[model samples]
Target: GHMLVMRPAQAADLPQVQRLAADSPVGVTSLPDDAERLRDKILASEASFAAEVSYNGEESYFFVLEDSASGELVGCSAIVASAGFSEPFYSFRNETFVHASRSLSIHNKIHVLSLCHDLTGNSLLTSFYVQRDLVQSVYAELNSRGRLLFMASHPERFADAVVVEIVGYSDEQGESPFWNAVGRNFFDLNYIEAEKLSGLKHYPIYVPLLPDAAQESMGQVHPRAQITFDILMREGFETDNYIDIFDGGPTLHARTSGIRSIAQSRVVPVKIGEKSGRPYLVTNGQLQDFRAVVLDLDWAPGKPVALSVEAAEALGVGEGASVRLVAVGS
Candidate 1:
């Protein structure tokens, strides 16, 4: 497999950025093709990267993965310094109730969904995607790590807690059970069109939803996201509170300081001569020009991290320069 580097997205990357969105699944509303919308997103991301503090609570950073050998953009992800800074970010939270009848001797656990403005102040993890071929490969770490790299670079820009809204499951007929069961009645547009309109225009669908409450366990989550769910679980993201209103897919939440990848990251000098053993994530931790790559490790406790000359050059750092390193994954 080719080596990959994940870095902040630049204005020049617009063409590739659009391609990433185009190649992504139909329900992913975070990335859209409209030129103006894309330009605004890019500009906001650039400002987010350069901003000292989010004064107005609106800043976001976008990252892209590039093939070290080919320079093609293969994946992307983003971080909203503060979610719902302008408008409210809404979702359905899971609630469980108990119903018991003493006379009939009947007992059952009931799951219900409730609309809420739960994640407004939290930072957001958004627009995560990888090339179809690299979904689970070592490089796939770019989807999650790129955002971690951002946090490691600008810890002050994010809230203590963060949440991610995953694309909900849609079947071959382009119908989502969760949407059909809930969102369809309130939204006049189909799931795909609704998502596009939401991204392209701030078209409001935030109103009362169908069945007001729903059977939490009845929503069908996508089988493809099982691995992602497992990964987030390992990273300390929880599903106890929220799920996508459009699809029953789980919404993962975690404290910013608790995410393993970000919490465990640290800076160390780059040691140029070493034989590779286990793999390690290495980054040039520059906030405005953040860059990361996966490289094998050679270690001695308390010693500076070592890497090949190629790795050093790739990271744009030389011996004795600091590079962020973590044991997360590619």
Candidate 2:
């Protein structure tokens, strides 16, 4: 029942990953459609996986999802050990200010957007891409949430909190109303051009100044990213006042340990037997040797989980070897 596998991305995966990036729509800051930048990212991921570190620093881990039957690279995702390690992680923190008049006997609350580095130093989940047809499939879960399992196994390599920037709304013409109304006013750049540039620096903007269309579009998930957003929401990530400065998308944040996959995952000794029960995300819990697959598993509290011979081999674990398991759905 396990036909998809997620593993650490290697140097040879550059070409496929680049193709995936190219297919991705604009506003995906981490997944630029550039080959050289992606090459550097892959190299950095390889170095991070091989490094010996006790705590999170500037390390990043990248993973690719492969179709076992077709041997195709269908998706990829990554995690940054620490955001703002090299540069500032800017976000627009939504705020409200009260304007009062003593004699006028009138008071009003005005919404404001403040540019801040509040999300700096937190772990970041980025560069998530999957095949369009597979986005609704379970493969998407394995591609996106599989990293949570990886973080669960290696908690020291990640920060206490995890954040992901959802792509903002864009029209059929590929123009962002929010960016056109707000970002372009200060930067003098189009949406696509500004997105490629990634970061921005500007003072706070009054929320009321934005057009109604822009105001409504704020924090709206791009059509292509809706499924990804839903999956993260189910995993305990919440969108607070913080929004991505680029496209004004919602930035989801959650405690590292509170993530559903990480918090509910149980480490159980591998028992090679008939695969049963529901499809669960299973991993060997070993760095460099880490492997996760969606396999039918029968699990219970304080009991050894049973896996088919093929499932055990797919995870690179033998009988009696300990493995972590978490249900794919709540």
Candidate 3:
């Protein structure tokens, strides 16, 4: 059987990671197609992993999934310990304002989009990119949920809440209806052009002023991003009345303690033996040497978890070593 493992992204993985970034569609600001920036990210991840820290700050961790048999990098994801550490993290907060005309004896509630920094200081999940064919497979689960296991192991290095910005809907021709109705009026650049630029602005946008098409497109997820949305929703994340200002995508948010994996994971000592039971996302629980993989293990309360030699070696653990384990699906 082919084995897939998730580990910290290293400087050597820059080329493959950059290729994944290049293949990604527009609106993934964290994964630019530039080499230097990707290299810088890898370097920063390495330093963050190696540094000793007491609480969440500017540390950012990047992870990569690899096919151990063929030595191919298949996916990548990242976590920003403290978003907006240097600058404000911006989003559009959905609000409603009351309008009344006493003379006319009429009152109405109008929807408005207010530019806000409400998500600032929260941990951010970004740059999640996996091959399309593997999107619904366990490989994707390991790539996505493995980061949560890491956060579980190092609770002190993350914010109390976390957020993910899903890419918004765009037609086959790469045109955004929301952008056409809202952003186009303010910026000269088209949808794709604005996506590449990656920026924002502040103003209360009256939703009624925008066309119906744009109003409907607000908080709509791109077809390709549906799997990620499903996974996050299943993990207890919810849309918190905030959206991406650029593409109008929904921003999923959840308290760190409420996330399923993080909340349910158990730390147990390992026992090298025949594997059994349901598949679980297991981690070595090491900082710099962190590693995670999906494996079937014989687990029981008040007893050591039985793990096979191959899976144990993949996680860099031996007998009596404590490892974090959580079920793949609820």
Candidate 4:
């Protein structure tokens, strides 16, 4: 198969990236498509990648990827370099409970919560978007695995552990638990439209505390989603006990060192003097983020690294361009 590549994104590719994001199945998780909003988003992303902007809460590292042969520019995926880690990114965490009243001989179930900056000091992953044609079973295992591989490859550019923000499912009429429970009160817009206007991050902040019924609906778990999530869980990526604010999608976390393939994959550097024009191992990228592999070996002491031709195009960083790299040790 033609190789796929993942790399950091650039400013010039904004329009296509935006379109890819707009078309993502889990639509509009990134910044909205408005000119003003996209401009602000670009500058903010560039700054964060440059470490220029700092959120009082969690900040993000926007990225891009592509299919070098297909010339398909994928959407973006990134880790909020520092969430509550350095500051505070507040969210209304969904808490589940099983309440039984022995005296009254009754039982009750609840999952109620309010927004708070409790995800402190965690490298939260968000803005995960890909081409609509990409995901088949909700969680595209290859793409998810690729992102993890990238994190495992460059452990230092990220936090110790990685948390993935998931997209929530919507109804046929285009409704979301997050929107009904919170967004409708603040933004007053439906899910898709609100996603177009702002983003999942801009979900409703001020709403009446959720009732048990509301929480149950918002935090309702799909068995299929659980199956997809098992991908992360198998690799040691855990929920660490938090759910997404908008869709109530579970946020999974795993120590960078714990991912099976990343921890075990070896990078086999090509000794040839020139770029091989082919990647050693490629992540099947659908949107804007892709991965270049070199057998996944010890990236310790910072050995010389090269990007395959596929990698260069996907990254939006030219040949010989230096990229941020990190390593997670077991």
lDDT of 4 at 158: 64
Q: What's the alpha carbon RMSD for model 1?
A: 4.1
Winner on lDDT between 1 and 2 is 2
Model 1 TM-score (2 dp) = 0.86
Which ten-residue region of model 3 has the weakest summed lDDT?
195-204
Specify the poorest-scoring 10-residue window by lDDT in model 4: 270-279
Q: For residues 154-218, could you state the per-residue lDDT of candidate 2 as single tens digits?
A: 88788889999899998887799888887798898888888777622156688998899999988
Per-candidate TM-score against the hidden true structure: 0.86, 0.94, 0.95, 0.65
Total clashing residue pairs per candidate? 0, 0, 0, 29
Return whichever of 3 and 4 wins on TM-score.
3
Model 3: lDDT of residue 111: 91
Runs of candidate 1 exceeding 4 Å displacement: 52-56, 96-110, 202-220
RMSD of 2: 2.1
Superposed by TM-score, candidate 3 places the C-alpha of residue 197 at a distance from the truth, in angstroms, of 2.4
As a whole number from 0 to 100, the lDDT of residue 195 in candidate 1 is 70
Query: Over the stretch 32-123, how does candidate 1's per-residue lDDT look in tens digits?
Result: 76667777888988887786544456888888889889889998888887878978888776766667988988886665577777789888
Each model's lDDT comes to 0.73, 0.85, 0.87, 0.53
Q: After superposing candidate 4 on the true structure, give the runs of residues whose Cα lies further than 4 Å from its correct spot.
A: 25-28, 39-59, 84-88, 96-111, 136-142, 181-187, 200-216, 220-231, 272-330
